[PDB]
Amino acid sequence: NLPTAQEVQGLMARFIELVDVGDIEAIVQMYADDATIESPFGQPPIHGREQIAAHYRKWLGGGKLRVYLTGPVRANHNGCGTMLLRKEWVWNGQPCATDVILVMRFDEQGRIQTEQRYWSEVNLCV
Numbered sequence: 001n002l003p004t005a006q007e008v009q010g011l012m013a014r015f016i017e018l019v020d021v022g023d024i025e026a027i028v029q030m031y032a033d034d035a036t037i038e039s040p041f042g043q044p045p046i047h048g049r050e051q052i053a054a055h056y057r058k059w060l061g062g063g064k065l066r067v068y069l070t071g072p073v074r075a076n077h078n079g080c081g082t083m084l085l086r087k088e089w090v091w092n093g094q095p096c097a098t099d100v101i102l103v104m105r106f107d108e109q110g111r112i113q114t115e116q117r118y119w120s121e122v123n124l125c126v
């Protein structure tokens with residue numbers, strides 16, 4: 001009854017494609033109304049399309065954030081998918097780069113219900 005692996009792959013691919021061009025309005029639509037993006041920093045989770053919109057607006061509004069799909073998009077048949085990305089930007093006045101594993105869980109309507117992210121900071125200074 002949930003989205004097949006192929007659908008998940010396509011959806012996450014499209015998600016990356018939407019992030020690449022900074023289509024925030026389109027991105028927010030891919031999430032469920034009560035979607036949740038858990039924090040990888042031990043903060044309380046983002047919840048609702050409003051907070052998600054604000055989050056993506058904040059982080060993508062600048063345009064100075066690069067995101068590259070490094071690994072292939074994998075997915076099971078439990079409506080869950082995973083992918084490996086590299087994020088590159090600069091906070092304050094210090095260059096920053098990190099590898100990120102995104103895990104997305106889709107609902108029966110094909111929208112993102114729960115999303116998790118796992119970081120691995122890239123060595124740059126030494």
Ligand SMILES: */C(C)=C\C(=O)c1ccc2cc(OC)ccc2c1
Binds near residue numbers: 038044045059087117
């Ligand atoms: C990349 C430069 C940043 C993130 O991917 C990022 C930043 C902040 C949050 C907060 C949160 O819950 C408050 C969930 C995910 C992220 C992701």
